[PDB]
Amino acid sequence: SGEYPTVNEIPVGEVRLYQIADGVWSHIATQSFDGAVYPSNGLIVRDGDELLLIDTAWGAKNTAALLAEIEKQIGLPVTRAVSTHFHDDRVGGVDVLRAAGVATYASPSTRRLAEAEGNEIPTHSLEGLSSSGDAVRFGPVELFYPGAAHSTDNLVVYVPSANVLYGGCAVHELSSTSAGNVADADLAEWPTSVERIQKHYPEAEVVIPGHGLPGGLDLLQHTANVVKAHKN
Numbered sequence: 001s002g003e004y005p006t007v008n009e010i011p012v013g014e015v016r017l018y019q020i021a022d023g024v025w026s027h028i029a030t031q032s033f034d035g036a037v038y039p040s041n042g043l044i045v046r047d048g049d050e051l052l053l054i055d056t057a058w059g060a061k062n063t064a065a066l067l068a069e070i071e072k073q074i075g076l077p078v079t080r081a082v083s084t085h086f087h088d089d090r091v092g093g094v095d096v097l098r099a100a101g102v103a104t105y106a107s108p109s110t111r112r113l114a115e116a117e118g119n120e121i122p123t124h125s126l127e128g129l130s131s132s133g134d135a136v137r138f139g140p141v142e143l144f145y146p147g148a149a150h151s152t153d154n155l156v157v158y159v160p161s162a163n164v165l166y167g168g169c170a171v172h173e174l175s176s177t178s179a180g181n182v183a184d185a186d187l188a189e190w191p192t193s194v195e196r197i198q199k200h201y202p203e204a205e206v207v208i209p210g211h212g213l214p215g216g217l218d219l220l221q222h223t224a225n226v227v228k229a230h231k232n
């Protein structure tokens, strides 16, 4: 009924959308992994009479449900998708997208990691993102590579029309006490990568984490704090 939707409010398999700003929504779904249930976010950005999708809904059936939810709520076609790192909460569902006629994109780093680990593989390579601090335009967003953090390949996405910063899994929600799933992380580089984000996007108004509630710029500092403390 209007609040940001949370893990116990979304059965696995169902997707909800949340309006962030004019022409910007997040998508929220839930999935089981290793016997626990987790929420996760992605982004939808209006691109004229089409939509750009950022990240899958964490699984094939969730991603089909995402497409159906977008058709219900928005009614414009998803034409392109970008995955912001190689994990299943970002690429699981790319096969569904690709069979729905969505052109799927990720960095070469993400593509290599996905292939090596047996995750679904976006079709198209995003060049120009291989050095920390790199940025490229993609439709109505800017893609930015901050350096290694949650994963070595993680990208962030900025919506300049709305000052929306989608941090993906390099950014944690304010209620987080722990640094999430750190299996593939670089805890030592993570704070430096967050500081690059802070420097590059000082006018962000909304910050969206990869999992959990959006907020403001404080999510960035909070993330740096929790990662440093976890590493400690």
Ligand SMILES: C[C@@H](c1cccc2c(-c3ccc(NS(C)(=O)=O)c(C#N)c3)c(C(=O)O)[nH]c12)N1C[C@]2(C[C@@H](CN)C2)OC1=O
Binding pocket: 033, 038, 039, 087, 088, 089, 150, 169, 178, 179, 180, 181, 182, 183, 184, 210, 211, 212
């Ligand atoms: C698919 C993905 C994955 C799965 C399960 C949970 C998470 C989480 C995560 C964990 C705790 C959280 N909150 S909590 C402490 O319970 O309160 C929250 C929240 N909100 C989010 C994240 C994240 O932090 O981004 N990602 C996850 N994978 C899997 C894996 C690849 C590797 C195996 N080779 C392990 O690494 C990874 O990230």
Ligand SMILES: [Zn+2]
Binding pocket: 085, 087, 089, 150, 151, 169
């Ligand atoms: Zn991840």
Ligand SMILES: [Zn+2]
Binding pocket: 087, 089, 169, 210, 211
């Ligand atoms: Zn994640």
